[PDB]
Symmetry: D2
C-alpha cells in the first residue's frame, strides 16, 4: 500500500505521514524544499521510514512515485498558502488567482493525475486537507475561505463520481491543529506560549485546547484504512468544537 | 472502559457492540427483548463477550451498568422507530409525539442520566445514531426526518457544552447500512436479493452497495478510542455517497 | 387572502401581522392572552386591522378561522418558549418534553391541521419561525437548539411533500431580532439600553446591530406573496451575519 | 439607485434587469454581445428602460457606470459558463482554471472593483448568482459544482467583513430556472417541450415545474430593496424543492 503526502512539513503533513507509516504504508512525501537535495537528504536521514521526493508538480510527482514504489493507493493533498487579513478592496485580483491556484487548483491537479490508475485498479483513497474557514465565522479572510470551500466541494463532488469505481474521497477541514515548527497554521509559538493566544483558543473552541498532529494523523489513517469507505463524501470538521460564542450577558 | 449500546439487535447495534468489544471495551448491551430472561440468556450464550442487561428505562439502565461494572465511559444511543410513509394530514399529532419520544427524547434521557458521572471524572464519549434523513431528499417522511434532525442537533449542541469537561459528542447519520434480519432499516432481504431493491441502491448511492455493520462499528469504535476527540460535534453522513441524481437526459 | 399568526405579541408576531395586513391580507391572530376577553378586546381596539382570536389549540384555531374568515391561505407559526441556560445533567427529561412540545409539536400540529384544505385548494403558504440556535455556537442551550432544529427540519421535509400540491414551506431562523416589549427574545431593555449588551451585539453580529420587526415582517410578507414559491424548503437565517469571531491576536 | 447586472441575456439576467427596473432602480446591463454596437443598440431598442453598456472587463465596466450614472449601489454578478459532464481524468487542469476564472475569479473581480466606493458611502448591495450544484447530488460535474461553491463561500465570507460597512452580500444558488432562448441553463426547449425533460423535472423537483425568471428577479429585487438587509450572508437555494428521491420500492 503506497501513499503520497504533500507539503510534508506543514499543516497536516507530519501527523499524516508518520501515522500512515506506522499503519504499514510506504509513504512518499513531497515538500517545496525537497527541491534542494540538501534539504531532501537531511529528511531521509531523520526519517528512514518515510521516503521523500524532489519532484514538485503533480504529474511528475505521480509518475515518479508510480515508477519507484508501485502505484498510488492513497493521496493526501495537504494544501497550504499564507493567510493575510486584508479587506476585499485592498487585494489584487491576481492575489485570489494565486490563492485559488494554491488551495484549489493544486488538489484538482493531483486528483486528476492519479484518478485513472486508481479507477483502473478499482481502488484508492483521496483526501484533501482544507479548512474550517469555509463558510466560517472570520472577517477579512475572503480569498482563503472561498478557495478552501472550493476544495471541500471538489472533494464531495469527486466522491460522487468515483464511488462507482470503489474510490472514497474525503475532505478534512481543520482549525487550531498544532503545526509545531511549521507556520501553517498553529505553530507552538505563539499558540502554546503567548498568553493572549492561549486565552483565544480557550474562549472559542469547545475542548478549550489546540488539536494535535497525532489526532489529525489518526483520522487520515482511519479514512485511508478501507475500514469506513461508506463515509465517502464527508467533510470532517477537524476543529475541537470551534466556534463557541458566549451566552448573553446579564 | 465500559460502553453501553442500546437496542443492540437492530440498526447500528451489532456492529457497535461486536467492534467495541473487539477493541477491548467492556460492552453492556440493552434491548427491548432482554426484558425476558430467555431472550437475554440466549444472546449471552451466542455472544459471550457481550453482557446483556435486563433494564429498560433510561435511569435504571445506567445505574445497573454502573453497579455491575463501575462506570460508563461510552454511551452509544442506538435509537430506533418504524418508518411509515404517510402524508402530513394523515398523521395524528400523537404519532409525532411518539416518534419524538423514541428518537429524540430517548437519547436526551440517556445523555442526561450519564452526564454528571462523566463530567465528574472529566472523561467519556457520547454517540447518537440518527439517520441521513435529516435534511434529506425524501417526502412523506416528515416525522422521522425531523425527529432525527433534533437528535443530531442535540449531539452538536451537547458537544459545545461538554467540551469544557473533555467530553466528545457525536452523531452518526446513516443510510443503506445492512441490518441483518433486523427491519431497521435495511434487512438483507429484500435489500440484497430483490432486483428492484438492488437497483434502487445502485441508482441513488455513490458506492453502489449497502453499507456494512462492520463499517459502522469501525466508526463508533474509532470515535470512542480517544484517538480523535477533536472531531467532537461532528455529524457523520454514513450514506455511501447518497443521494446521486442522474444527469440531464 | 387569509393569514393566521400565532403568539402575536412576541418574537416575530407583530412584525408579521402588521406587514401581512398592509399587504392586503386579512390577518387573524392568536395569543395565549386572548384567553381573557379582557386582553383580546384591548387589542382589537388597538389594532382594528388585525383580527384577534380567543381560541388556543391548533384545531379550534383553524376551524374558528376557517369558519369566520373563509379559508387559511397563510400560516405563520411564530413559536416561543423560555430559554434557560442549564447544563444537561441539571434538566428534567420532562423539561425537554415541554420544550419540544412548545417549539416542535406545536407547528407540526398547526400544519397537520391546515394541510388538507390547503392541499384541496392546491394553494397556501406555511412558515415556521424557528431559531439560528439550531446547529449554532452557544453552550448549555441544548434542549432549545435541538427542538428548534427539529422545527426547521420539519419545514424542509414538509416542503418536499407539499410541493406536489403547490404549497411552499419555509423556516425563518432568527437571531437578534428586536422583540420590543416582548421578552421573546431581544427586548429593547436591555438590548438597546445596557452597554454590556450593545457591546455583545456589536462584537458578534456582522451588521453590528439588532434586526428589526419590520425586517422580519417584510421577509414573511415576501414569502407569503406567491412571488418566490420556487424557494420552497429554504431555512432563512435571519441573523445579521451572526456569528462573527475575531481574528487571531498578535 | 443604480444596479449593474452582468451577462444580462443569460441565466438570471433578464429577470434581474427587468424586475430591478420595474422597481425604479436605474439598471446598467453588461453582456458579451454588447461588445458589438449593433447587438447593443438592438437591445437598447427592445428594452428602452435598461441601459446596456459596451465595457467588458471588470474594472472598465464599474468606472463606465460610475461615469454615466454617478455611483453603483447594487452589483448583480450573474455568472455563467458551459456545463459539460466529463469524468475527472478526462479534463485538463486548464479546463478547471478556466471554469474558476468565469465562476469564481469573476465575481471576486467585480466585488473588488466596487467595494471601496460602497464602503465609503457605507451603503450598497452585492448579489452573486451561483448554482444549486455546490454540495449537490450530481456526478462528473466536479469543476462546475466546486467553482460554484467557492463563489457562494465568497459571498458568505464577504458578508462578514462588509457588515461593518452596512453592506449586505448574498448568493443565489439556482436550479431549474427557465432561461428563455438562453442555453444557461434551462432553455424552454427542450425543457418545456421534450417529454423526457418534462418528466425529469416532475421527478426530481418538489414543485414539479421549472422556476421562472420572474421568481428569480423578484428575489434579487427584494434582496436589493433594503427591506431585509438582515439576511446578509444568506445562500439562497432557488431550486423548487430539488432534489427529491423516491421512497423504497
Ligand atoms: C486563518 C483562520 O484559520 C483557519 O481558517 C484554519 C486553518 C486551516 O486553515
Ligand atoms: C428511507 C429512509 O431511511 C433512512 O433514512 C435510513 C435509516 C437511518 O434511517
Ligand atoms: C438564546 C440564544 O438566541 C437564539 O437562539 C435566537 C432566538 C430565536 O431563538
Ligand atoms: C445540472 C446542473 O445544473 C445546475 O446546477 C443548474 C444551473 C445553475 O447551474
Ligand atoms: Cl488548523
Ligand atoms: Cl441505514
Ligand atoms: Cl431573535
Ligand atoms: Cl438554473
Amino acid at each position: 500500500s503506497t501513499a503520497i503526502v504533500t507539503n510534508v512539513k506543514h499543516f497536516g503533513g507530519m501527523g499524516s505521514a508518520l501515522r500512515l507509516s506506522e499503519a504499514g504504508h510506504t509513504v512518499a512525501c513531497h515538500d517545496e524544499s525537497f527541491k534542494h537535495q540538501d534539504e531532501l537528504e537531511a529528511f531521509a536521514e531523520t526519517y528512514p521510514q518515510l521516503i521523500p521526493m524532489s519532484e514538485q508538480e503533480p504529474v511528475e510527482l505521480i509518475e515518479a512515485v508510480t515508477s519507484a514504489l508501485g502505484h498510488v493507493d492513497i493521496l493526501v493533498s495537504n494544501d497550504i498558502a499564507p493567510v493575510e487579513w486584508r479587506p476585499i478592496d485592498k487585494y489584487a485580483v491576481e492575489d485570489y488567482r494565486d490563492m485559488v491556484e494554491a488551495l484549489q487548483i493544486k488538489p484538482f491537479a493531483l486528483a486528476n493525475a492519479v484518478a485513472s490508475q486508481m479507477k483502473r485498479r478499482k481502488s484508492g483513497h483521496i483526501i484533501f486537507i482544507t479548512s474550517a474557514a469555509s463558510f466560517g465565522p472570520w472577517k477579512e479572510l475572503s480569498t482563503y475561505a472561498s478557495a478552501r470551500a472550493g476544495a471541500s466541494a471538489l472533494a464531495n463532488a469527486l466522491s460522487k463520481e468515483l464511488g462507482e469505481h470503489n474510490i472514497p474521497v474525503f475532505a478534512i477541514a481543520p482549525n487550531g491543529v498544532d503545526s509545531g515548527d511549521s507556520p501553517y497554521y498553529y505553530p507552538s509559538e505563539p499558540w502554546k506560549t503567548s498568553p493572549e493566544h492561549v486565552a483565544w483558543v480557550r474562549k472559542y473552541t469547545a475542548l478549550q485546547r489546540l488539536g494535535t498532529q497525532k489526532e489529525l494523523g489518526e483520522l487520515v489513517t482511519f479514512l485511508a484504512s478501507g475500514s469506513c469507505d461508506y463515509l465517502t463524501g464527508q467533510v470532517f470538521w477537524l476543529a475541537g468544537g470551534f466556534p463557541v460564542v458566549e451566552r448573553w450577558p446579564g
